[PDB]
A paper describes a structure:
In this work, the first crystal structure of a light chain dimer originating from mice is described. It represents the light chain dimer of 6A8, a monoclonal antibody specific to the allergen Der f 1. To achieve this, the recombinant production of antibody fragments, Fab and/or scFv, is needed. This work started with the quest to crystallize the murine IgG1 monoclonal antibody (mAb) 6A8 Fab with its specific antigen, Der f 1, originating from house dust mites and associated with asthma and rhinitis. Moreover, when the 6A8 light chain is not partnered to its heavy chain, it forms a dimer that lacks Der f 1 specificity and interacts non-specifically with a wide range of allergenic proteins, such as peanut, dog, and cat major allergens, as well as the non-allergenic protein bovine γ-globulin.
Author numbering:
A (entry chain B), B (entry chain A): 1 to 212
The structure:
Amino acid sequence: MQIVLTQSPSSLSASLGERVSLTCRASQDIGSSLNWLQQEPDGTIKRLIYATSSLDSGVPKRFSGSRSGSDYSLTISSLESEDFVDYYCLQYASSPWTFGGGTKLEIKRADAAPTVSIFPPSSEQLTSGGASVVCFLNNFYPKDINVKWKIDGSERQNGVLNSWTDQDSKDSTYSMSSTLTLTKDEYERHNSYTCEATHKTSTSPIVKSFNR
Amino acid sequence: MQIVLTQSPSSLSASLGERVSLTCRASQDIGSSLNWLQQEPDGTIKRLIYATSSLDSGVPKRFSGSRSGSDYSLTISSLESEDFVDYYCLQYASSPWTFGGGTKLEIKRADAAPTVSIFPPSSEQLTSGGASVVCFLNNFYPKDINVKWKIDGSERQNGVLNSWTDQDSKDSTYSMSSTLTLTKDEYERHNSYTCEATHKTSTSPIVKSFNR
């Protein structure tokens, strides 16, 4: 049986100067044999902490590692802007070596509803095969959101491409585009087009629509 | 001894059933103490190979690890669709443990020029926080692309967010949005807005504009 490391939380929202802890629970005893890794935006992975508690050379003092039973914690005493990256626990007590799911440090922000814009497809696009209806969802928080597409009241699930931004460095919000990619034929078959957005900040969905 | 692992190549394009090799050169002797990791797009990390040559339990036979002096190689004999992810070498011969820069496998395809679409901001958007001009660059390959913004012929450098999609599973292309955030005042000061793209597949830059 592979040792499973349950990493808490998956996403952690905090502010500059906050004290935060990442927890990593081992499914079987690994003793002191846990390392803490950091993955930078350039994709590079470093080891911060080894053997549960020990700081690697050059690692800032604000990083510290502890163990409470089968729960291993990385603690950052006072968060800095460089620290809002991905973190992984790694156990090397047993083969195979296994990693936690990871923890993304994210900047905590007041909840924001998305500004929703719906654009019908271009005349240039339309005369060639394709018809893409684009739905913009701008500057919402938190990241968790849902977009439905409706054609003449009826939900359409397929032919939909969703693209998210990372957290905005300026205002700490998320944006996303949903594209309902379609044929010229299909588009002119139906009349009414609606993307509806479901977010924490509204008990009922935000709807944007158009016809011909 | 603090050991540098030089990983080749940084990016690797190949097709289904192709044989590929990753190299990882150690700056100092690490003996057989090198592991090969796989990172899934969701950020999950597995160990495929340990102690240079050994396959971890359940790892497919098409993965193989070898060493030629201080050069350590991961070979995938016949690529499958699940295999087009990130790979890292990891040495544990010396403290601190160090990783290679990484290697992203992508699916090779014919070079594609982006289709450029420009969306002016909504009235709702324009009054409320950011007034966003959005420039879509669709179904281009390779992923590397550069997008400038011009306002009435003058280049705008700040208030621009550039966001990539992962490689499309259907057609192996990349898409990309460039968002020029602007003040309500700034926007209605000027009339002409232009995103201009530099890509391999165009000898000259790709231009989209609109006026008021």
